[PDB]
Amino acid sequence: SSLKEIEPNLFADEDSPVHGDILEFHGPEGTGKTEMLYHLTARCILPKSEGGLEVEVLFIDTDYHFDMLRLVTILEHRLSQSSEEIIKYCLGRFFLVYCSSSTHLLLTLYSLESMFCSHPSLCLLILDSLSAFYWIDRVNGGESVNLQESTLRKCSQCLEKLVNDYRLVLFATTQTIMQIDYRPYLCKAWQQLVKHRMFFSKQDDSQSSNQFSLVSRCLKSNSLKKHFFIIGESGVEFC
DNA sequence: CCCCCCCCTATCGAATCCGTCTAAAGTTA
Ligand SMILES: Nc1ncnc2c1ncn2[C@@H]1O[C@H](COP(=O)(O)OP(=O)(O)OP(=O)(O)O)[C@@H](O)[C@H]1O
Ligand SMILES: [Mg+2]
């Protein structure tokens, strides 16, 4: 479970067997966060023979924007030899969970622990749009700051406990609402829990309609990394 | 920190010539 093999391109020099890492994605609409997650799942789900890793992955769906036809098309167009049996065998490992509210999210977080401890093979976790319910619970609590964000703080505590308990690697998805620009609006604790930021940007022109820019910083070094990549029907490819 | 629009005005400035018609009246050995 070394970070050099996971993504040597985005992660320049952070290679070590990870005891736990938190990654989050930030970007406006239609930039490619979901496509990047699809590429990561494709590279993490295939058999070891076809450049895969053969390790478990769990996907929490909150935006309700997960598309399975796109995922199966990406997996079919990624590998070399394609068949129904092998694709079924590969997709027998993907895990998907649905949520509807912050309280329901916390209940699902707590409930997952049974299967989670029953499976030591689980090593990678995916969460998307943890700020989907930001406005709802910000308005429910009124002016009382403590009244709002409280369930989100409890959820962050539970996630941190799990990830530092059973050595997970986590990728998160955020949203751009207000205003290298960045204006945080979540709880302070989860802001501290982050390790790197993946700022997502998109170029307007049709020539660069497939090329996008990524900026990453390290909390302990404040070093900037730039990356250009091209999207495709077969998945995501780099420059 | 959040999300959407407004409106007409005012006159100026002169040029360029053509084309002819109609005859009448005798005088002094
Ligand atoms: N087959 C394809 N070939 C090339 N580009 C594609 C293909 N399918 C989708 N795309 C591109 O992928 C881009 C990313 O779309 P997507 O909805 O996954 O973005 P996202 O930023 O992850 O999502 P969101 O806007 O919901 O935050 C789209 O702008 C689209 O142009
Ligand atoms: Mg998306």
The CATH number that applies at residue A11 is 3.40.50.300
Long-range pairs of A96-103 with CB within 8 A, sequence gap ≥ 24: A96/A59, A96/A61, A96/A66, A97/A58, A97/A59, A97/A60, A97/A61, A98/A61, A98/A64, A99/A60, A99/A61, A99/A62, A101/A133, A102/A133, A102/A136, A102/A137, A102/A151, A102/A152, A102/A155, A103/A151
Nucleotides of strand B within 7 Å of the protein's CB atoms: 1-2
Instruction: Give, in Å, how far the C1' of B12 lies from the CA of A204.
Output: 51
Pocket of ligand 1 (CB under 6 A): A 27, 29-35, 65, 231-233
What ranges in A112-149 are assigned the alpha helix state H? 113-118, 134-140
- Contact predicate A214/A198, CB 8 Å: yes
Walk across the sheet containing A169-173 and list its strands: A94-98, A56-61, A122-127, A169-173, A21-26, A196-202, A211-218, A225-232, A235-238
Total number of domains in chain A: 1
Which nucleotide's C1' atom has the smallest distance to the CA of A179? B1
Instruction: Give, in Å, how far the C1' of B6 lies from the CA of A153.
Output: 48
Containing structural domain, residue A81 = 3-238
Angle between helices A68-78 and A33-45 (to 10 degrees): 50
Instruction: Give, in Å, how far the C1' of B18 lies from the CA of A30.
Output: 87
Resolution (A): 2.6
- Give the CA count within 13 Å in the CB-facing half-sphere of A87: 16
Strand partners, A26: A199
